[PDB]
Each structure stands twice: as structure tokens, then as C-alpha cells.
Amino acid sequence: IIGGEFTTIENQPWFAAIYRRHRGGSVTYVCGGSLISPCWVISATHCFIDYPKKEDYIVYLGRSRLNSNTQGEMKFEVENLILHKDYSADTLAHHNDIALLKIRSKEGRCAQPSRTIQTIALPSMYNDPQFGTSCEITGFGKEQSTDYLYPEQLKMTVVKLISHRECQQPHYYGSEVTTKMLCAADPQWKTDSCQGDSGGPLVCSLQGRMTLTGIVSWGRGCALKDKPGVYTRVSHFLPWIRSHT
């Protein structure tokens, strides 16, 4: 997250921290995700495409820090890793950039809701907020595009939804942006998601409830003029989500 503010997991208790085991035992952060039911985390296919083996991943819930434990956190293995069959990528755009992780602990349990671990509501079909609506993004992603490291503490910020029509302008992303994507950005381009925030939640209040409107998918650089963050438009994938969960 470029700009914005530091936060803790209580402010985004559906946030899932996804890591990968190596290859000699080191564990590195991969991407964010969102808990949509006790056993299911939703994220982006691009986070896993190159290394699709479920055994390689660890998921944490109730975690506020990257490399240190947080009191109340839960650690999970990935029972199933479901990537979208229609996924595709070019230099930039990732199409159908959506993934589901079925989570299970060593002891065979799913998530237990608490003050630090809660599910996030899915939107109703084809129902998004109007353009200019302020939404929140959360993650352990880079604080500056040039940074080598990720922040140790969870961050969040606010970005405003941009219309498909504005985002498809040539100076923005042209044809790269489809109707199954949502653009969002800061009016001054001063705050944004960035590398390492992929798979994480874009949350909007809809019909009075915090709703998973988007999943951080792609973009050119970060907090860059005329280059919004691009998000998988969750309201266009409800049949896929329902079937695979």
C-alpha cells in the first residue's frame, strides 16, 4: 500500500496473509486474500499460477504483521487451490484473475471467527457502487514502488472507483480493462495498492454492509498518474465462486 495508514487486523478481520514454503524451508510472502467463509479464502490466480501446488502454501488469519506472530492468529494448510480455468495474461492485464483456497489446519479445522478473524460479505450479482465511491484496500504490499522490502505492519488506504468508460480511455488502460475488472485510484494518484497487495480486498459499503467488491489484480507501477489499480470485479464471478465453494 502506497500512502494510506498503518492498521491492524481488527480493522480488516477477513484479511488473509498467504505465504509460500521453499525449497529448503524458507517461507516468503506471496499475496493477500479474503475470508469469505470459515473454510474458504478468495485471492488472485496470478499469485499461484507459476507454482500451483497447494502443498507449497501457508495461510494465516488474524495476522497484523508480516514476519512476526500476532496474538490470536490461526495458521492453515491449503486443502485445495482452485485457479480460474479461463485465466490469461499479457504484458499487463490478467483476465479472470480469481482463485479460491480451501483452508484446513493441521488439526483439520477451518477458521474460528473472533475479534481478529471474520468473514467478508460477497456482493449481490452485477451490483457495484457508483463511480467516485470511496473504497478501502488492505495489504502487506510495498510502501513505495522502488522498495525492496515489504512493510512489517499491515496497511490500508482509500481509493475511489473509476468508471469503465474513464478507465478504458487510451491514456488510462485502453482495451486492457474489461467489464470483469474495476479500476480504482486516488484523485491525486498519491495512494494505491502495490506489489504484494495482489489477491487482497477492495472493500466497499454497499446497501449498508462492508462488501468484497474487488480483488487486487494488476496495474502499471503504483500510485502513478493515469494508471489506476485494477481489481477483479467480484460481482461478475458469483456463479464461479458458488460452484467452486
Residues annotated as catalytic are 46, 97, 198
CB 203, min distance to another protein, A: 17
Confirm if 7 and 155 have CB atoms less than 8 A apart: yes
CB 50, min distance to another protein, A: 5
Give the binding range for another protein (CB under 8 A) out of 125-133, 163-171, 205-213, 222-230.
Answer: 222-230
Residues sharing a CB contact under 8 Å with residue 39, sequence separation 6 or more, in sequence order: 79, 102, 103, 104, 110, 111
Examine residue 217 and tell whether it contacts another protein (CB under 8 A).
yes
Q: Give the nearer residue to another protein in terms of CB position, either 30 or 61.
A: 30
Examine residue 50 and tell whether it contacts another protein (CB under 8 A).
yes
7, 116, 168, 198: residue in contact with another protein (rule CB under 8 A) = 198
Query: Using the 8-state DSSP alphabet, how is residue 129 labeled?
Result: P
Q: Give the nearer residue to another protein in terms of CB position, either 216 or 234.
A: 216
Examine residue 63 and tell whether it contacts another protein (CB under 8 A).
no
Number of Cα atoms under 13 Å in the Cβ half of residue 82: 15
Question: How far, in Å, CA of 134 to CA of 245, rounded?
Answer: 29
CB 30, min distance to another protein, A: 5
Question: How far, in Å, CA of 200 to CA of 232, rounded?
Answer: 10
> Exposure pattern of 217-241 as b/e (b: 16+ CB <10 Å)?
bbbeebbeeebbbbbbbbbbbeebb
Measure the CA angle with vertex 81, ends 31 and 45; round to 5°.
Answer: 50
Examine residue 195 and tell whether it contacts another protein (CB under 8 A).
yes
4, 33, 196, 201: residue in contact with another protein (rule CB under 8 A) = 196
Parallel, antiparallel, or unpaired: how do β-strands 201-206 and 134-139 relate? antiparallel
Residue with cell 489484480: 217
1-40: contacts with another protein (CB under 8 A) = 20, 30-31
CB 28, min distance to another protein, A: 8
CB 125, min distance to another protein, A: 26
Confirm if 51 and 20 have CB atoms less than 8 A apart: yes
39, 58, 89, 158: residue in contact with another protein (rule CB under 8 A) = 89
14, 140, 218, 237: residue in contact with another protein (rule CB under 8 A) = 218
Q: Residues 122-161: x/- map of binding to another protein (CB under 8 A)?
A: -------------------xx--xx---------------
Confirm if 84 and 96 have CB atoms less than 8 A apart: yes
Contact residues for another protein, defined by CB under 8 A: 20, 30-31, 46-51, 89, 91-92, 94, 141-142, 145-146, 193-199, 216-222, 229-230
